[PDB]
Amino acid sequence: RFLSPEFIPPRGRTNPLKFKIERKDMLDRRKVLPIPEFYVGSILRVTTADPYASGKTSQFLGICIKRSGNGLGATFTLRNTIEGQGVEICFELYNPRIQEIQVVKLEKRLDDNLLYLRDALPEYSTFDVNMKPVPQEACQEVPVNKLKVKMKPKPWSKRWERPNFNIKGIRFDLALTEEQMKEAQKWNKPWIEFDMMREYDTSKIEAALWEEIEASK
């Protein structure tokens, strides 16, 4: 049972009725436009109507790096290098101007966020726009790419070495000495792993949502 992230509500004071109304519209839109299942690290090709152009659609291919937003306003970002230029485009799932969504390669990456790939070597981020879709197995989990990317010189956008980030897809050993990791580990805050005040559980909400979504079908 794959429940898409947008359906899961976040903690807050927002009215539950809004989610109920939002879900109905999302389900109605899903009939018009089918939203394929995908995870961060999957390469997707999405067809969208071009506003600047007249009656012309375009398809952009890139590896999914981040998923954000909830409900009808949920968006997904896919990254690629085109003409040697790294480009990341954020696509809203339920935008009326998205004609079609194609998952060229359905797969998962070591980390749920691939912002560090910007600091990684270009080849790890380079993907052919015209690459054809590869076969997928329905009754299986999405392939998980365990390849560890190599970073560029130490100056990075964020201190991935810090334990808080806990990035498991970075070849820290090649570019960082064990002593440097210990310096990064000084921000461990071990109580954070054991603190129950920062825990938000949506399992019950996720389970409840599943029947409601299936019922609408």
Binding site: D25, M26, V32, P96, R97
Partner: peptide, 11 residues
């Protein structure tokens, strides 16, 4: 644009 309408194409 009501939901469940056809995807908007900028023709």
């Amino acid at each position: 644009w009501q939901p469940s309408e056809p995807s908007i194409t900028f023709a």
